[PDB]
């Protein structure tokens, strides 16, 4: 068969979790997408010559209980912590999502990537230096993305897979 990589996309509402996931899977930018819908996506891809399966959960952060969500949070191999560069509250939210991940995984060290989405916008409230500093303090990579222009979308998910690969080394 093929190696599976279970990825979970987390972050504040409206950062672009769905738009980044739909861009990667379906090669389309959603101008509007139901903020309450939480779906899983499977995509066969080639990363550094490895034919592999991506099993991605696009979380919605809803109160409603979900057996599938519980599974992905506990068995998730890598997490994409997404914030919007024009939403300071979402950047501050990252540390909560990291604490939530640490809780659901029962681990201080989880493969994860910091994603600074909406890089296409000319007005920023979170600069690249602030974002790099946060990622450096966690010891994780930082990828600037735009679901609209496709900039860094593939890079964000592939770098996360590369982070999981690093943990699988011994």
Ligand X SMILES: Nc1nc2c(ncn2[C@@H]2O[C@H](COP(=O)(O)OP(=O)(O)O)[C@@H](O)[C@H]2O)c(=O)[nH]1
- Summarize as ranges the residues that interact with ligand X (CB under 6 A): 11, 13-19, 30-33, 35, 117-118, 120-121, 146-148
CA distance 26 to 163: 24
Contacts of 124 (CB under 8 A, 6+ apart): 85, 86
CB of 59 to ligand X, least distance (A): 8
Shorter beta-carbon distance to ligand X: residue 13 or 52: 13
| Position of minimal CB gap to Mg ion | 18
CB of 67 to ligand X, least distance (A): 21
Where do runs of H (alpha helix) occur along the chain? 17-26, 67-75, 88-105, 128-138, 153-167
Residues that bind its own copies (CB under 8 A): 88-89, 91-96, 98-99, 103, 125-127, 130, 133-134, 137-138
Question: What's the chain's length in residues?
Answer: 170
CB of 5 to its own copies, least distance (A): 26
Shorter beta-carbon distance to ligand X: residue 24 or 110: 24
For residue 25, state whether it binds Mg ion (rule: CB under 5 A).
no
For residue 30, state whether it binds Mg ion (rule: CB under 5 A).
yes
* Binding-residue pattern over the window 130 to 149 for Mg ion, x denoting contact by CB under 5 A: -----------------x--
> In terms of Cα–Cα distance, which of 79, 77, 74 is closest to 58?
79
Shorter beta-carbon distance to Mg ion: residue 82 or 107: 82
Torsion from C-alpha of 103, 105, 109, 113, nearest 10 degrees: -100
Contact 25, 17 (CB under 8 A): no
CB of 151 to Mg ion, least distance (A): 13
CB of 20 to ligand X, least distance (A): 7
* Pair of tokens at residue 1: 């068969």
From first CA to last CA, the distance across the chain in angstroms is: 22
């Amino acid at each position: 068969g093929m190696t599976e990589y279970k990825l979970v996309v987390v972050g504040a509402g409206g950062v672009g979790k769905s738009a980044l996931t739909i861009q990667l899977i379906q090669n389309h930018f959603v101008d509007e997408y139901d903020p309450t819908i939480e779906d899983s996506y499977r995509k066969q891809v080639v990363i550094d010559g490895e034919t592999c399966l991506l099993d991605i959960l696009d979380t919605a952060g809803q109160e409603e209980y979900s057996a599938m969500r519980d599974q992905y949070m506990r068995t998730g191999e890598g997490f994409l912590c997404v914030f919007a560069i024009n939403n300071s509250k979402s950047f501050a939210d990252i540390n909560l999502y990291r604490e939530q991940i640490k809780r659901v995984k029962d681990s201080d060290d989880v493969p994860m990537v910091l994603v600074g989405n909406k890089s296409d916008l000319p007005t920023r409230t979170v600069d690249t230096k602030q974002a790099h500093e946060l990622a450096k303090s966690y010891g994780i990579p930082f990828i600037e993305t735009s679901a609209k222009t496709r900039q860094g979308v593939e890079d964000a998910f592939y770098t996360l897979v590369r982070e999981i690969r690093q943990y699988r080394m011994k």
